[PDB]
UniProtKB/Swiss-Prot annotation:
FAD binds at residues 46-56, 110, 115-118, 122-125, 177, 381. Keywords: Antibiotic resistance, Cell wall biogenesis/degradation, FAD, Flavoprotein, Oxidoreductase, Periplasm. This is Decaprenylphosphoryl-beta-D-ribose oxidase. Component of the DprE1-DprE2 complex that catalyzes the 2-step epimerization of decaprenyl-phospho-ribose (DPR) to decaprenyl-phospho-arabinose (DPA), a key precursor that serves as the arabinose donor required for the synthesis of cell-wall arabinans. DprE1 catalyzes the first step of epimerization, namely FAD-dependent oxidation of the C2' hydroxyl of DPR to yield the keto intermediate decaprenyl-phospho-2'-keto-D-arabinose (DPX). DprE1 is a highly vulnerable and fully validated tuberculosis drug target. It catalyses: trans,octa-cis-decaprenylphospho-beta-D-ribofuranose + FAD + H(+) = trans,octa-cis-decaprenylphospho-beta-D-erythro-pentofuranosid-2-ulose + FADH2. It is found in: Periplasm. Disruption phenotype: Traditional knockout mutant with dprE1 disruption could not be achieved, suggesting this gene is essential. Conditional knock-down mutant of dprE1 show that down-regulation of DprE1 results in rapid in vitro growth arrest, swelling of the bacteria, cell wall damage, stop of cell division or lysis, decreased survival in macrophages and virulence attenuation. Cells lacking this gene display impaired growth. PROSITE patterns: FAD_PCMH (PS51387). Was identified as a high-confidence drug target. It is an enzyme of class 1 (oxidoreductase). It comes from Mycobacterium tuberculosis (strain ATCC 25618 / H37Rv).
Length: 427
């Protein structure tokens, strides 16, 4: 163990905790079982690759278990479509291993550098949520080290389904995931057929997302403008598509379908708008995973607003543009059907990712966004959150009492605690 000053991805809210780095799973149990012997506050929390901007992976004055050295891939089956990996396997290595099997990772996020454990405990969502769902929708099994010292096999529709769905999106507060079984998406190739569209306004962006085009694509997301004033506010470059098949690939890349090949004055004028429009408009473009998907002093803010709340979603975008806080990196998506995890972030609706530069009055401004998001029936993402209040969060997640009841039953001693847990009063 080493006392380290660790952080979320946001470089924010430093906390000092004793970190454990061991590949011995049995060793991991000893420390957890030792903490219950200490029978006191400052519990233990698991940690993946620290890609969450929040304080969900730190436990100040407590214990942190870095799960990254448990990166053994046990089995991959192309017939069953099942992989079996330890919770410290990252999604980049898992993808690499599975492509030769004709398999694809069911849910991939913006970054590839996330653990299986991290992917489950934040129930990560991706460019394909509307066609595939969250990461938890694909976990066919997982083994969880609970507070009692026991390791419990968990299943989605099994007898222990309650504790399963509480661990899905449960920010590691149910226990430490050790090993999981994930059903993969079958794939003919490692390429994408891509379809591109450019919009001129927020209305035209929303129109395209509710006209029915979404049905044609399994993957969908868009870069959007949040600086320009109406009507240009909300204009977007949309990138949509699906996993390609061999026959769809050009013959020169038919060789190895499952290969992962390694990587003015007009601009603002009417011709610039026209040039950008045609260059952003394309049909059936064959692309790499890099080309399609993965092309400190900031604060990333992510919220979703229920689908039917179209106008109140348009209102909050107008607010952000009006506030004088300028965000350039903006991701727009329309989530499909939510799952049955109480603490799951995604619900069907209008997902926004904004990235604000830290400056005077931002903390207070985003507290006013928290207010509107909550008011318009939406929620925030624990993975992105470092500074919302417990009260605001509890109201955003109506099933929070349902989740806490599970966590109280499985971990009454409060063996598993984190900075977030205390902040959002989930213990
Ligand atoms: C550039 C970038 C882009 C991103 N894009 C997306 C995106 O498109 N969609 C999206 O949903 N998210 C996105 N994220 C956030 C990230 O995908 C999630 O926060 C992810 O869960 C973090 O994985 P991690 O391995 O870093 O885990 P950490 O950040 O280290 O931990 C995350 C949480 O999971 C718990 N946990 C981790 N491992 C285990 C385990 N073995 N057992 C029990 N609990 C565990 C921890 O306790 C902690 O609460 C992005 C992050 C970055 C930096
Ligand atoms: N929001 O956090 C978010 C949401 C989504 C999706 F809509 F697909 F769910 C995708 C997404 C983000 S943030 C993100 C990202 O990493 N963006 C910025 C970036 C900066 C530097 C280099 N590459 C990307 N992605 O993809």
């Amino acid at each position: 163990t080493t006392a380290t000053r660790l952080t979320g991805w946001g470089r924010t809210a430093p906390s000092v905790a004793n970190v454990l780095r061991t590949p011995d799973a049995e060793m991991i149990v000893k420390a957890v079982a030792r903490v219950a012997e200490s029978g006191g506050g400052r519990g233990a929390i698991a940690r993946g690759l620290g890609r969450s901007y929040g304080d969900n992976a730190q436990n100040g004055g407590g214990l942190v278990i870095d799960m990254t050295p448990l990166n053994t891939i046990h089995s991959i089956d192309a017939d069953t479509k099942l992989v079996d990996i330890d919770a410290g396997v990252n999604l980049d290595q898992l993808m690499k291993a599975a492509l030769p099997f004709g398999l694809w990772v069911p849910v991939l996020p913006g970054t590839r550098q996330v653990t299986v454990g991290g992917a489950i405990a934040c129930d990560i969502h991706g460019k394909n949520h509307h066609s595939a769902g969250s990461f938890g929708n694909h976990v066919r099994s997982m083994d969880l080290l609970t507070a009692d010292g026991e390791i419990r096999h968990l299943t989605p529709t099994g007898e222990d389904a309650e504790l399963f769905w509480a661990t899905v999106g449960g920010n590691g507060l149910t226990g430490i995931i050790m090993r999981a079984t994930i059903e993969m998406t079958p794939t003919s190739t490692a390429y994408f057929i891509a379809d591109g569209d450019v919009t001129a306004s927020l209305d035209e962006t929303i129109a395209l997302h509710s006209d029915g085009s979404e049905a044609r694509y399994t993957y969908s997301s868009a870069w959007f403008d949040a600086i320009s004033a109406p009507p240009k506010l909300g204009r977007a470059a949309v990138s949509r598509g699906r996993l390609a098949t061999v026959e769809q690939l050009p013959a020169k890349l038919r060789s190895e379908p499952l290969k992962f090949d390694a990587p003015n004055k007009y601009t603002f004028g009417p011709i610039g708008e026209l040039w950008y429009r045609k260059s952003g408009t394309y049909r059936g473009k064959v692309q790499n995973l890099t080309q399609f998907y993965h092309p400190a002093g900031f604060l990333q803010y992510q919220f979703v607003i229920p689908t039917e709340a179209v106008d109140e979603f348009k209102k909050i975008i107008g607010v952000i543009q009006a506030s004088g806080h300028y965000s350039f990196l903006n991701v727009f998506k329309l989530f499909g059907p939510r799952n049955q995890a109480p603490l799951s972030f995604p619900i069907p609706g209008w997902n926004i990712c904004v990235d604000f530069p830290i400056k005077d009055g931002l903390g207070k401004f985003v507290s006013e966004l928290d207010r509107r998001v909550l008011e318009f029936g939406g929620r925030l993402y624990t993975a992105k959150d470092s500074r919302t209040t417990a009260e605001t969060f509890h109201a955003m997640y109506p099933r929070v009492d349902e989740w806490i009841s599970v966590r109280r039953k499985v971990d009454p001693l409060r063996v598993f605690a984190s900075d977030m847990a205390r902040r959002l009063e989930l213990l």
